[PDB]
UniProtKB/Swiss-Prot annotation, chain A:
Present with 17200 molecules/cell in log phase SD medium. Disruption phenotype: Cells are viable. Ubiquitinated, leading to its degradation. Ubiquitination is promoted by HUL5. The keyword Iron does not apply. This is 26S proteasome regulatory subunit RPN10. Belongs to the proteasome subunit S5A family. The keyword Chaperone does not apply. The chain holds residues 1 to 197 of 268 of the full protein. It comes from the Eukaryota. Multiubiquitin binding protein.
UniProtKB/Swiss-Prot annotation, chain B:
The gene is RPN9. GO terms for cellular component: cytosol; nucleus; proteasome complex; proteasome regulatory particle, lid subcomplex; proteasome storage granule. Acts as a regulatory subunit of the 26S proteasome which is involved in the ATP-dependent degradation of ubiquitinated proteins. Residues 182-350 form the PCI domain. Signal peptide: none annotated. Coiled coil: none annotated. Present with 12400 molecules/cell in log phase SD medium. This is 26S proteasome regulatory subunit RPN9. The keyword Transmembrane helix does not apply. GO terms for molecular function: structural molecule activity.
Amino acid sequence: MVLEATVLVIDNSEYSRNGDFPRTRFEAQIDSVEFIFQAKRNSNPENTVGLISGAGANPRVLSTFTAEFGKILAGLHDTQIEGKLHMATALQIAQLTLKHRQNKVQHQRIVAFVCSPISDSRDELIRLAKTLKKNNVAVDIINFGEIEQNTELLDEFIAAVNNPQEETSHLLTVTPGPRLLYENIASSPIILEEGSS
Amino acid sequence: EIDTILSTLRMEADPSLHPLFEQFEKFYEEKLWFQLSESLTKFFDDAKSTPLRLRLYDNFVSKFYDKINQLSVVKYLLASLKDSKDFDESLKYLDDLKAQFQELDSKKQRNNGSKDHGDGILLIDSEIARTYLLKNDLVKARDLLDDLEKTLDKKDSIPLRITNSFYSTNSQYFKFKNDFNSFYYTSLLYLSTLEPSTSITLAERQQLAYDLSISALLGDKIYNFGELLHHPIMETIVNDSNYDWLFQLLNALTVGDFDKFDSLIKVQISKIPILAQHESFLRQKICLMTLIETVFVKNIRMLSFEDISKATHLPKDNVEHLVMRAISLGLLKGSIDQVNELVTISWVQPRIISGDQITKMKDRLVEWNDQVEKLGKKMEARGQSIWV
């Protein structure tokens, strides 16, 4: 949590133009991108967040690690609502963005939103799971897409990956029904998590 | 409200179209709007024929004119308005949807924050030109095709759907008018850009397949008959009787057999009235296709008139005119000697490169490798002393 650089993956699949979270699922997510930046800042103001997309065939680096609210917002405005989620590409690219930073002292966190079922090959995931351990990265999943009808491929992986350490990777399962996604993120741990050490 | 309508639809519906209906309601309740798009589409794929289509559209459109992407909305409506017989009714509905979309997009552009909505409009526009053709008002429909083509092509990026719709409109206009030349140009394009949708019925495919083959008899530059046959549109539809004798003609052109040609044409010239009025073209066409075959095989630079006379079985008067025609097409280039009765061909137009020819090319290129190689080595040795 203390002095942390974050790649946030904002996903705008075809399932994200839905309306599970009223009025529109898209607009409930917009508020969450804004809130995540703020929560992390409120923790420790030397935290930074950068932004990549899950949407399209591939990710697009909209914004690198920065303190300006302005960069996240212009990036946020850029969307395609017929994008599609590929779990694997998003992970891989996030790790790369982390290798270069304004301050390299900062800890390594991936926050990723999942807004559609995940059906990527298993083989890919296994290998990535232990890649992550090499370079010592933790990841929090704000999950509300996957659980609607599809068993969690990521949970076990993250669990195994975590060590005693201040950093704590987590599987966070957040009630997918009408309750407002952003409201529930504020009311669950995301910066109220405790260390594992 | 919407509940009383759902009751009527389920009952007279097939018992195998019954659960499609149940799903509609459930997805609404849960506010899955993606799933909801999907299930709607499943209905209109195969139940556009049935009398219930129209109903489902007034109600569905009014409910889901905001949930689902815009381009989703107009596509459903389109299907309904083919089976709608009245073409003043079709025109009414179109104008209501056109206004609807223009307003909607104003708010909606800003909510998405980015989405091209000028797509929907173009599709609407395309369909209105189509109304007009059916009522035989070729004049109104014409300037609307014009304008469509200009705005579309100014675009640097275009979906398949839009350009496909526009080509469809064109195709229909050209066969109504009885212009063989134009249709052939369109049909090809339409095939290239053709949506991966299987909403496109077999009937539609069969009718087009038929018009394309009739165009290519009559044609102005088609000698590409084999290439045409290799594509799904004709390729699969061969055992049917309509596509028998038809395809037989195409293949008679390839070998240039005059004898098989003559028998087919005598029967069929009565049957299809297009062929009756276009008799000159068709008659020239067998003769030409033979000429291109004789010329390509004999790569020597001169041919007597006597070769042409025998192959095409025509008198010599007619021979030199036939030689003028090839030259006008640009199929061939060269000059005519009347004093010796020769055609000096000086250019051949590339054709389909068969497998045998791949090897032929290679044999000559080795020979010409060696020439460069021999020549450089000896000339280095000659006057070695100076090469500053």
